[PDB]
Amino acid sequence: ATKVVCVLKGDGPVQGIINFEQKESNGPVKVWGSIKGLTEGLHGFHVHEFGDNTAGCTSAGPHFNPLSRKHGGPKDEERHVGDLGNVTADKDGVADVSIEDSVISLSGDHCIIGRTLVVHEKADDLGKGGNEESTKTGNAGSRLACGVIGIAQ
Amino acid sequence: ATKVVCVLKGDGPVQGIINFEQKESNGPVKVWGSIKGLTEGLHGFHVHEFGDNTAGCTSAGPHFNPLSRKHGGPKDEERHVGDLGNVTADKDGVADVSIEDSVISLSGDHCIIGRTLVVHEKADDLGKGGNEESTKTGNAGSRLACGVIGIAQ
Numbered sequence A, B: 001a002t003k004v005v006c007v008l009k010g011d012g013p014v015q016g017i018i019n020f021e022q023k024e025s026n027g028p029v030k031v032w033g034s035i036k037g038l039t040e041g042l043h044g045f046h047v048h049e050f051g052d053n054t055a056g057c058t059s060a061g062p063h064f065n066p067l068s069r070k071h072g073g074p075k076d077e078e079r080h081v082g083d084l085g086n087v088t089a090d091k092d093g094v095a096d097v098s099i100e101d102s103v104i105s106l107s108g109d110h111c112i113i114g115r116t117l118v119v120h121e122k123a124d125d126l127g128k129g130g131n132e133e134s135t136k137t138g139n140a141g142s143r144l145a146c147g148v149i150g151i152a153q
Ligand SMILES: *[Se]c1ccccc1C(=O)NCc1cccnc1
Pocket: A002, A003, A106, A107, A108, A111, A112, A113, A114, A151, B111, B113, B114
């Protein structure tokens, strides 16, 4: 009953459409869509704090972290709201995304509307990499494609 | 105290950066920035309902109109929330945008975050064009560039 969408663009072309839908404010958000143009393997997948793409994906800032937690994987209690783990691209460079998440929302202070979705160069280590950056960014590397998360029909 | 931003891109050469700032939730919104690649003269400038760029600026849908009014200019009582009038491009195709508007908001009710800002081919006649479409769209023609309005730092 609330639906939101994000078109991801960057060089390659890396390009994708990701849809989000939440039946009720207390419920999980289903996330689905496709990203093409990726290298085979894992790519970090995060909601970043700013829906600012004025100078490309760099202006999106850090992970969306309204509750001031450390970086983790989607299944972790200790995670940022924006920590959606990794998407996995096949040999053909396509990641078909199908996620349900209970921490992001389309309502309230966990809401991701107006933020940026980013797909990264490398895997997110989900805070298990053993360095300073692991519990901040997951060491997922450069931002390959991004877009602002908007209200859908 | 609330800042939001929008990068305008489209099928052609029209591209722009628009900033919105609102000191207080009950107060006016300052809109500023620049758009380039335009024909000299007036170009309609609207917030459209959906932050959806799936198939380009067309997927943004109609003017953002939560209060079910007819189309008008920004200084009119009878207007859509998204009716921000025209921007004006100079001889070099650059429109320097400077708008203060009392009807849009960046918080509270009916805010523009996660919606789409669109710059149009033709002038918006501000509901004074003398045909039915004037009171709906303003006869401002095709969508040259658009972007989802996102939260800024
Ligand atoms: Se959820 C959220 C986050 C940031 C800014 C605005 C919102 C919001 O809730 N907008 C109202 C809305 C959301 C979805 C569909 N229709 C209206």
